[PDB]
């Protein structure tokens, strides 16, 4: 029925060749994660910040606490090697399984075993496979907790003294905090869950998520869908694909904003400064320089009449001036020591800016996530010399693009699933065209 | 539904086709290569070599400013480098 | 019937009324010239050609 | 036009002496300047303090004069403000501050001479474009 | 049975590539326009006319190579190989911009050739010549932009150069100098091109989603026979869908397909007229009433006044390098600049 | 006969002159809210401090604008990405100075258009159609999401979203070119290929069908009366069109299958506009068009300009002029 270019649709009702397709494709994933880490480590120079080197995987490993010490300095590269090799090796085993089940294995599973066999329309079996995978994911989330609490901790950009690897002993359990984030506006100064800003809340939320996932896994093993759910959904392989494409799209969008705004679970030590951070850093940089020359930065009126260096947010908080007035919700470890209760504190500004904060401000203003597709750093009008594009832009853009096509894929397969379920996905039956049996509109 | 020429799919799967075209195709690629590696393409077309956009201490474009003396102006400029 | 953009095709085989139309066009064009000159004369200042 | 020994001949010190660099040293230096300095100093300006640039005329009015190989090598070791009144290694890269600016760790003495030589040669090649900013892009 | 009729027979034979009488104009000119551009983009500088590198030989990539226009000093010279400027020297001709006129003029005659081909093939096969008529829009754009426009100005220098990024610079020149986006002939052109793409997508989508089921396969392409009499999609169901979705829908398959011809062809023709005006610097640059208010009232600001400041930046910052024959020298202090930047 | 079932039956009825549906239940109110606010503000709103510098910009007809220069002006940079509903303002006067209508209009609009896309899926199901017209519309919807939501998210402020005005649109695209160089970005180039190409294929397909209409009328009547709505037979001769177009190019460059032809007509512009929408959306995070500034240098090291450098001169002129009172520091980092 299907053409070569829709050829994978021929696997819909071949559980054995479809198991192979999935497992072989999971091998490609593990393979990429493996090769790419080794490629990054082969290219890694430790005296250069990670974000001057096009690294996206090594920062993920560092953030988990491996390889790094105080301030994000890399101290031991062997955990990066290990993570790549193990992934790499494990892909051969998935690849082996994958081509075995796609080529030589039982083409359908149901004849060989009633446990592994499935029919898409079996609501109990489908909720049972969903149950198993929910548990697996619950376990995965708890592995993050175990690492944070019993196997070294995690990197904490907020730890006093430049940031450091820190073990997490009082995870947040209070559901008001954890589920409070889920209820926060996604808008400015609020951030929905992208505002999470300390590792205690990260680890606590993962305990919850692992329990909820294990409980739901068990729930879905032990139940079958209720009749309101049975009548609400399409129950077909393509329909389940469409639901998951919807979900991954949503998640891709979320991850986009997370790597763009969050500097806790994407430490700027590793990923480079966020857009807001770098903009705030510039205002800081010139406040520092001009004050050193004698400028009274609190009393300097800028051309518009707003403060040149310092003004008020719309709720009163003292903030950086210029266009970065838009970025006053930014919070970061190099800047919070200057915040008092009314926003930025003028006596702290006048007396207590340290050199490390001057360096960090200068470093981040000159490493903002602006650059060209061919990796010329900076604003579009800058000349060639600096080969830099922030990992934050590479990860934000790439995952925006993927998220968008999966929403398109969600629409594609959802509408097709609906039409196939009612039986007109192949077109209109000339002998029974529904419009010809309706009254006309006028 | 054909006009009588030999089908392409038939020609480019044929041993004779590839016997002729494994000589011709590299021969042309090599010729065009030599057009550039020899430096001939510079001289045919008038294109400045990396060292002859400017005279040594000169930062002025040698811009053609005359319609009918144009030819002579270009030549004057080329002297300013030899 | 005829669309709006074809009303004048009724002259294609009517040399009489074709000439009638060409006369009316010619009338309007010469009318224009005369009206345009008179308007320019009523507004022209002739007192400084420099 | 080309990269001749005249272009590559820059002052060694304030006494009057000259060193003549090679094409190798020049391309070496350009490359290390991109590695260690262009994030702030692309094109001979200074992003984080645009009032101070790398134009030869600006360097010659620095205290310690910096329009020679020695001035510049020295600055890369023990930088000072423009009037020479205060050492600024804590906020500017240099070998003295290579703990806090790790990129300076693997710079040999000859790397410093190349970098310094690129700085003095480039304005002879690009003129006003070196240190002039976007007006000359 | 004379030589003319024998030659007619031979030109109009049914072969893989139809020739026709129109092929005698078409094929040489098409091929020389194409050959010139590839030749020049590979080997030929713009140093002497523009101060620009512009070939692969010189280091340019696909986006920056161009066959650039001749120097402003050439005026509107035909710049014939054998003409008074190049005097037959092929090399000089290339350095003076001879390939620009060569490409423009052969391209012009090739476009005539192509439209005559559309007429010639249409007559032989027995169809109406609406595809030829439609092709007048591209011809108007080409002649108005590449020929009329620079003929109204000082020289060929200000026509577009044949290159990706050179055309980008043409786009920005017209914004800064002509405020071309403010021109309603351009606006009608935009509506026609974006209307065209809309109609393209929405008609293709409608048909593919009102298909009749005419075979049994999940791929519905196989269930069309190119000689079936029956429509392959339901006009009635498409019309009901858009009627209830959008309020109105097509009911006449002929008007629909005529409308698809009409929308983009008209838009291009409209933009062509705007460009004819810009040949004479007859722009829609300004709104007089806004300028009178803004001059007298320094608190009055619109998006209209904000875009003219942008145009003023464009002119002052790009003109010295884009118009090198003028020897503009603008000190740092005369350049218009906002605060800080 | 159950009351809710009756309501569910009118909502989803295919006999309503305009289909409502469940998506329509969100679409109708949200689009009326956005429309009514837009019309009122376009006529009568007072000047808005778009860049947060107390430099209000007049957008409406009553404050000295015409149709071409008028706009509903984006909300203040002081607000950034903060949510500014009416009830968060001390007074409607405050809300108006600070740009609150722009937020009301664009959020209702994006919602309502999203539902517009759902509504297209939904009526197709009720009529027994194939489902994908809404995938086509997702190209323009994505493009609207990019200029009104995604780009403001990446840059940190709705003050950099596209104005709801004709000249405001131009301001938006000029400043975009200076800060991103969209022209040198490949996803915009596919957008141009998508839109030029779609206009081309629009004209071709329209000219090819019109060329090959079967004679059904006299010279005195519109050829269009030769098609009767709902007739079974095709109204043109696709073999005559294919025979014409195949000869104009060559045989195998011309479609003989009407289904492939119309799918191709759908796919080309939809895909090119997907890309251009994704280009705006990725330049939202500053992954900009190619930069070849000073890429060609001579043997001494002189810069040898290219057309890319002339582009850069123009871009520089837009950069230094835009929002001329809004920058205090040398880099325009957002
Ligand atoms: C659509 C149909 C599709 C088919 C398309 C077929 C494509 C065919 C291509 C034909 C090529 C056309 C060549 C035209 C060259 C041209 O014009 O060349 C220009 C020359 C005149 O030369 C110009 O003349 C100018 C004025 O000079 C005069 O003024 C100077 C200052 O006072 C001095 O006195 C000087 O001595 C004196 O000559 C400047 O000198 C320019 O630099 C010089 O180029 O005219 C001449 O050749 C001829 C001018 C009179 C004939 C008019 C030609 C009609 C086409 C022009 C329409 C555009 C109208 C513009 C309005 C928009
Ligand atoms: C988990 C993800 C997922 C899964 C399992 C499927 C599964 C399926 N899809 Mg859906 N699809 C998805 C995501 C997914 N899709 C997304 C995200 C979109 C939107 C982009 C679509 C849009 C879509 C359409 C339009 C159709 C399907 C169809 C199908 C079926 C057959 C597909 C096939 O044979 O591909 C065969 C694979 C190819 C022909 C190759 C694809 C080439 C891609 C486009 C190029 C990408 C290149 C990349 C960008 C970089 C290249 C670098 C270079 C060096 C090579 C199958 C059931 C078909 C269907 O309805 O069947 C029921 C169908 O018509 N898919
Ligand atoms: C991740 C991508 C992916 C995966 C996993 C699959 C997997 C599969 N496809 Mg799809 N497919 C894909 C992409 C993919 N496809 C794309 C892009 C297209 C468009 C061209 C198609 C088009 C397509 C069609 C048209 C059909 C399939 C079919 C199938 C199945 C049977 C293939 C078969 O008979 O092998 C025959 C092929 C071989 C025997 C060649 C050998 C290939 C081997 C596996 C390469 C392995 C090399 C590797 C280095 C070995 C490592 C070994 C070591 C680990 C021990 C299989 C499960 C078929 C199906 O559904 O059957 C009913 C079918 O009809 N696919
Ligand atoms: C999906 C996420 C993702 C992201 C964000 C990155 C991001 C990065 N990679 Mg990795 N990469 C990926 C997947 C990813 N890659 C995959 C799947 C492969 C295997 C092919 C690689 C192979 C790879 C190598 C070998 C290298 C990188 C490098 C880099 C860096 C430079 C990117 C560049 O210049 O691209 C250039 C931009 C393009 C090629 C544009 C592609 C546009 C496509 C065609 C559109 C797709 C639309 C549809 C999907 C950057 C940090 C470089 C680096 O610095 O390493 C340290 C490097 O050398 N990557
Ligand atoms: C999700 C993936 C998946 C699924 C659902 C199946 C399902 C199946 N396989 Mg396949 N297979 C897979 C992956 C998978 N396999 C992989 C990865 C490989 C390569 C290692 C193979 C190689 C393979 C062969 C060679 C054969 C099967 C066979 C079978 C069938 C019987 C399995 C059984 O009872 O064995 C008994 C089960 C066990 C002894 C399970 C012991 C515990 C496992 C090994 C570890 C689980 C730990 C953890 C979850 C994952 C690993 C840790 C890692 C992540 C670090 C069944 C249909 C047989 C068949 O159908 O042939 C006719 C058969 O001969 N499989
Ligand atoms: C992969 C995850 C996953 C998936 C696919 C499913 C799938 C399913 N579940 Mg299970 N479930 C899971 C995880 C999952 N579950 C976990 C972890 C738990 C434990 C809490 C449960 C607990 C659970 C129960 C108790 C029940 C189901 C039921 C069902 C079925 C109907 C789903 C439905 O109508 O919801 C669609 C959603 C709604 C109808 C309500 C919308 C509510 C959300 C919160 C609105 C917010 C959306 C917003 C825009 C996004 C932001 C989030 C916000 C909170 C901030 C379906 C088979 C039902 C069933 O038939 O059970 C046998 C049922 O009664 N599930
Ligand atoms: C000498 C010039 C001339 C003459 C005598 C004709 C004569 C004719 N044309 Mg042709 N035509 C011409 C120039 C000419 N045309 C030009 C320059 C164009 C391109 C714009 C066309 C494009 C054209 C098309 C596309 C069509 C014709 C058609 C026709 C026929 C029917 C016209 C009709 O009923 O209009 C009726 C028109 C009106 C009732 C109102 C039109 C008003 C227009 C829109 C604007 C106002 C004009 C203004 C008042 C006065 C002109 C000022 C200035 C131009 C001098 C008729 C034989 C039609 C045909 O072939 O039918 C078989 C047809 O479809 N013509
Ligand atoms: C089915 C199918 C398919 C697919 C397939 C797949 C997807 C595959 C898989 C496969 C795989 C997925 C593979 C993998 C493999 C791997 C391997 C085999 C590994 C090995 C490794 C090694 C050897 C290592 C070593 C080392 C070390 C240890 C250290 C470091 C260095 C080195 C690296 C050397 C296709 C579509 C084509 C077709 C159809 C069918
Ligand atoms: C980890 C973590 C955390 C936590 C979190 C959590 C806890 C989460 C949750 C989550 C959740 C809990 C989610 C939810 C979701 C939901 C959803 C997403 C839903 C959906 C729905 C839908 C989709 C539906 C549909 C429908 C309708 C509406 C109608 C009927 C039909 C249907 C069914 C189709 C935190 C942040 C603290 C921190 C960091 C980390
Ligand atoms: C009867 C008679 C008489 C009288 C006569 C007369 C009184 C005449 C008049 C006439 C005239 C008094 C006429 C005039 C005409 C005019 C015209 C014919 C006009 C035209 C117009 C046009 C067509 C326009 C168009 C347009 C517009 C409106 C806008 C802009 C564009 C254009 C230009 C296109 C006499 C005593 C001798 C004798 C007896 C008889
Ligand atoms: C001007 C002239 C002339 C003419 C010449 C000619 C005629 C030439 C030709 C030439 C030619 C005829 C050339 C060609 C060239 C070509 C090329 C250079 C190509 C390239 C291509 C490529 C690069 C592609 C690639 C690709 C891609 C990218 C994607 C897909 C795939 C492909 C493969 C397509 C004569 C002699 C009369 C003399 C006077 C002057
Ligand atoms: O581009 Mn230039 O960058 Ca985005 O902000 Mn800084 O300036 Mn301003 O307000 Mn709208 O615009
Ligand atoms: Cl502006
Ligand atoms: Cl600022
Ligand atoms: Fe059609």
General description of the model:
The PDB classes it as photosynthesis. Keywords: water oxidation, membrane protein, light harvesting, electron transfer, photosynthesis. RT XFEL structure of Photosystem II 150 microseconds after the second illumination at 2.23 Angstrom resolution. Chain A: Photosystem II CP43 reaction center protein. Organism of A: Thermosynechococcus elongatus (strain BP-1). This is part of a larger assembly, with chains A (442 residues), B (82 residues), C (50 residues), D (137 residues), E (341 residues) and F (334 residues). Chain A has two domains: 1-272 and 369-442, no CATH class; 273-368, Orthogonal Bundle (Arc Repressor Mutant, subunit A). Chain A has helices spanning 15-43, 58-63, 78-104, 123-150, 175-182, 199-222, 227-232, 237-261, 268-271, 275-292, 346-351, 355-365, 391-422, and strands at 154-156, 164-166, 310-312, 318-320, 339-340, 343-344, 371-372. Chain A has 13 helices and seven strands. In chain A, helix 4 (123-150) runs antiparallel to helix 6 and helix 10 (275-292) crosses helix 12. Chain A is globular and about 85 Å long. Chain B is mostly helical and 82 residues long. Helices cover 52% and strands 0% of the residues of chain B. Chain B contains four helices and no strands. Chain B has helices at 8-11, 15-37, 40-45, 70-79. Chain B is elongated and about 65 Å long. Chain D is mainly alpha-helical. Chain D has one domain (2-137): Orthogonal Bundle (Cytochrome Bc1 Complex, Chain D, domain 2), CATH 1.10.760.10. Helices cover 36% and strands 4% of the residues of chain D. Chain D contains five helices and two strands; from the N terminus they run E-E-H-H-H-H-H. Chain D has helices at 23-36, 38-41, 56-61, 69-75, 109-126, and strands spanning 9-11, 18-20. In chain D, a hairpin with a 6-residue loop joins strand 1 and strand 2. Chain E has one domain. Chain E is 59% helix and 0% strand. Chain E has helices at 3-11, 22-43, 47-50, 90-96, 98-125, 130-152, 164-178, 184-208, 235-246, 253-279, 288-296, 303-322. In chain E, helix 2 (22-43) runs antiparallel to helix 5 and helix 7 crosses helix 12. Chains B and D meet through loops of B and loops of D. The complex binds digalactosyl diacyl glycerol (dgdg), chlorophyll A (6 copies), beta-carotene (4 copies), CA-MN4-O6 cluster, chloride ion (CL) (2 copies) and fe (ii) ion.
């Amino acid at each position: 029925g299907f053409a070569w270019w829709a050829g994978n649709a021929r696997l819909i009702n071949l559980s054995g060749k479809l198991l192979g397709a999935h497992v072989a494709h999971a091998g490609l994933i593990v393979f990429w994660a493996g090769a790419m880490t080794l490629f990054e480590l082969a290219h890694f120079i430790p005296e250069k910040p990670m974000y001057e080197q096009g690294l996206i995987l090594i920062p993920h490993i560092a953030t988990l606490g491996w390889g790094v010490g105080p301030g994000g300095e890399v101290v031991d590269t062997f955990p990066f090697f290990v993570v790549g090799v193990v992934h790499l090796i494990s892909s051969a085993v998935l690849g082996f399984g994958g081509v075995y089940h796609a080529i030589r294995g039982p083409e359908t599973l149901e004849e060989y075993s009633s446990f592994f066999g499935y029919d898409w329309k079996d609501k109990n079996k489908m909720t049972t496979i969903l149950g198993f995978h929910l548990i697996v994911l619950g376990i995965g989330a708890l592995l993050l907790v175990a690492k944070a609490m019993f196997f070294g901790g995690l990197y904490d950009t907020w730890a006093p003294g430049g940031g450091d690897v820190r073990v997490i002993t009082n995870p947040t359990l209070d559901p008001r905090v954890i589920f409070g984030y889920l209820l926060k506006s996604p808008f400015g100064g609020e951030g929905w869950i992208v505002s999470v800003n300390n590792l205690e809340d990260v680890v606590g939320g993962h305990i919850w998520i692992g329990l909820i996932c294990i409980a739901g896994g068990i729930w879905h093993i032990l139940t079958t869908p209720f009749g309101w759910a049975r009548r609400a959904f399409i129950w077909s392989g393509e329909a389940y694909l469409s639901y998951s494409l919807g979900a991954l799209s949503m998640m891709g969008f979320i991850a986009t904003c997370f790597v763009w705004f969050n500097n806790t679970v994407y430490p700027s030590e590793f990923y480079g400064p966020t857009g807001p951070e770098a903009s705030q850093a510039q205002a800081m940089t010139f406040l520092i320089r001009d004050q050193k020359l004698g400028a009274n930065v609190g009393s300097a009126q800028g051309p518009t009449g707003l403060g040149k260096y310092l003004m008020r947010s719309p709720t009163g908080e003292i903030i950086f001036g210029g266009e970065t007035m838009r970025f006053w919700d930014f919070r970061g470890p190099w800047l919070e020591p200057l915040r008092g209760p009314n926003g930025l504190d003028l006596n702290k500004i006048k007396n207590d800016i340290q050199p490390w904060q001057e360096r960090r401000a200068a470093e981040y203003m000159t490493h903002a996530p602006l650059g060209s597709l061919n990796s010329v750093g900076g604003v579009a009008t800058e000349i060639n010399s600096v080969n830099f594009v922030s990992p934050r832009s590479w990860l934000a853009t790439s995952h925006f693009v993927l998220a968008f096509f999966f929403l398109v894929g969600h629409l594609w397969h959802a509408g097709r699933a609906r039409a196939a379920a009612a039986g007109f996905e192949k077109g209109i039956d000339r002998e029974s065209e529904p419009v010809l049996s309706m009254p006309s509109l006028d | 539904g054909t006009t009588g020429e030999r089908p392409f799919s038939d020609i480019i799967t044929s041993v004779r086709y590839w016997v002729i075209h494994s000589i011709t195709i590299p021969a042309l690629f090599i010729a065009g290569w030599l057009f550039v590696s020899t430096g001939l393409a510079y001289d045919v077309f008038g294109t400045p070599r990396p060292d002859s956009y400017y005279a040594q201490e000169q930062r002025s474009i040698p811009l053609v400013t005359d319609r009918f003396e144009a030819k002579q102006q270009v030549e004057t400029f080329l002297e300013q480098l030899k | 019937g005829l669309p709006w953009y074809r009303v004048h095709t009724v002259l294609i085989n009517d040399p009489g009324r074709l000439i009638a139309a060409h006369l009316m066009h010619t009338a309007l064009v010469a009318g224009w010239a005369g009206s345009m000159a008179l308007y320019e004369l009523a507004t022209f200042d002739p007192s400084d050609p420099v | 036009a080309e990269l001749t020994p005249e272009v590559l001949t820059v002052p060694l010190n304030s006494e009057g002496k000259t060193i003549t660099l090679t094409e190798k040293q020049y391309l070496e230096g350009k490359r290390l300047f991109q590695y260690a300095c262009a994030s702030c100093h692309v094109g001979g300006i200074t992003k984080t303090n645009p009032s101070l640039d790398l134009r030869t005329e600006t360097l010659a009015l620095a205290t310690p004069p910096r329009d020679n190989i020695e001035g510049l090598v020295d600055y890369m070791k023990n930088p000072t403000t423009y009037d020479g009144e205060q050492e600024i290694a804590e906020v500017h890269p240099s070998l003295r501050s290579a703990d806090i600016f790790p990129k300076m760790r693997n710079l040999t003495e000859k790397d410093l001479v190349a970098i310094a030589g690129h700085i003095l040669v480039e304005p002879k090649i690009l003129g006003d474009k070196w240190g002039g900013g976007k007006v000359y892009y | 049975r004379g030589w003319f009729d024998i030659l007619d027979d031979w030109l109009k034979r049914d072969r893989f590539v139809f020739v026709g009488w129109s092929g005698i104009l078409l094929f040489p000119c098409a091929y020389l326009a194409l050959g010139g551009w590839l030749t020049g983009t590979t080997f030929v500088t713009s140093w002497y006319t523009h101060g620009l590198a512009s070939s692969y030989l010189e280091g340019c990539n696909f986006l920056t190579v161009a066959v650039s226009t001749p120097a402003n000093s050439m005026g509107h010279s035909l710049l014939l190989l054998w003409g008074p400027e190049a005097q037959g020297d092929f090399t000089r001709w290339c350095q003076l911009g001879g390939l620009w006129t060569f490409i423009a003029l052969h391209g012009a005659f090739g476009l005539i050739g192509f439209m005559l081909r559309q007429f010639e093939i249409a007559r032989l096969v027995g169809v109406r010549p609406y595809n030829a008529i439609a092709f007048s829009a591209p011809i108007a754009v080409f002649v108005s932009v590449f020929l009329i426009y620079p003929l109204g100005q000082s020289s060929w220098f200000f026509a577009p150069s044949f290159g990706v990024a050179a055309i980008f610079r043409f786009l920005l020149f017209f914004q800064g100098f002509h405020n071309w986006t403010l021109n309603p002939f351009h606006m009608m052109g935009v509506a026609g091109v974006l209307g065209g793409a809309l109609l393209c997508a929405i008609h293709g989508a409608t048909v593919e989603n009102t298909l009749f089921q005419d075979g049994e396969g999940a791929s519905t392409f196989r269930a069309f026979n190119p000689t079936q009499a029956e429509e392959t999609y339901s006009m009635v169901t498409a019309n009901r869908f858009w009627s209830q979705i959008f309020g109105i829908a097509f009911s006449n398959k002929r008007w629909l397909h005529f409308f698809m011809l009409f929308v983009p062809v008209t838009g291009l023709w409209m933009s062509a007229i705007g460009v004819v005006g810009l040949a004479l610097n007859l722009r829609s640059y300004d709104f007089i009433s806004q300028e009178i208010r803004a001059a007298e009232d320094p608190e009055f600001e619109t998006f209209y006044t904000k875009n003219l400041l942008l145009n003023e930046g464009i002119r002052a910052w790009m003109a010295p390098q884009d118009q090198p024959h003028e020897n503009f020298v603008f000190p740092e202090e005369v350049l218009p600049r906002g605060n800080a930047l | 006969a159950n009351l809710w079932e009756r309501f569910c039956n009118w909502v989803t009825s295919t006999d309503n002159r305009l289909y409502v549906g469940w998506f329509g239940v969100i679409m109708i109110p949200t689009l009326l809210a956005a429309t009514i606010c837009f019309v009122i503000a376009f006529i009568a709103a007072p000047p808005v401090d778009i860049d947060g510098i107390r430099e209000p910009v007049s957008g409406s007809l009553l404050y000295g604008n015409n149709i071409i220069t008028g706009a509903v002006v984006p909300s203040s940079n002081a607000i950034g990405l903060h949510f500014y509903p009416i009830w968060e303002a001390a007074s409607l006067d405050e809300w108006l100075y600070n740009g609150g209508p722009y937020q009301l209009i664009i959020f209702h609009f994006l919602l309502g258009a999203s539902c517009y896309m759902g509504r297209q899926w939904e009526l197709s199901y009720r009529l027994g159609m194939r489902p994908w017209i809404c995938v086509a519309y997702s190209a323009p919807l994505a493009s609207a999401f990019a200029v009104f939501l995604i780009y403001p998210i990446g840059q940190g402020s709705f003050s950099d979203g596209m104005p709801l005005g004709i000249s405001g649109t131009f301001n938006f695209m000029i400043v975009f070119q200076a800060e991103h160089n969209i022209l040198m970005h490949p996803f915009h180039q596919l957008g141009v290929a998508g839109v030029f190409g779609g206009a081309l294929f629009c004209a071709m397909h329209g000219s090819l069908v019109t060329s090959s209409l079967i004679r059904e009328t006299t010279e005195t009547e519109s050829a269009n009366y030769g098609y009767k709505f709902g007739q079974e037979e095709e109204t043109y001769n696709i073999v005559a069109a294919h025979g014409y177009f195949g000869r104009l190019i060559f045989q195998y460059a011309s479609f003989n299958n009407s289904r492939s032809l119309h799918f191709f007509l759908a796919a080309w512009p939809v895909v090119g506009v997907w890309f251009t929408a994704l280009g705006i959306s990725t330049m939202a995070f500053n992954l900009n068009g190619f930069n070849f500034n000073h890429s060609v240098i001579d043997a001494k090291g002189n810069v040898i300009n290219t057309w890319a450098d002339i582009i850069n001169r123009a871009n520089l002129g837009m950069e230094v002029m835009h929002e001329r009172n809004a920058h205090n520091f040398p880099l325009d980092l957002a």
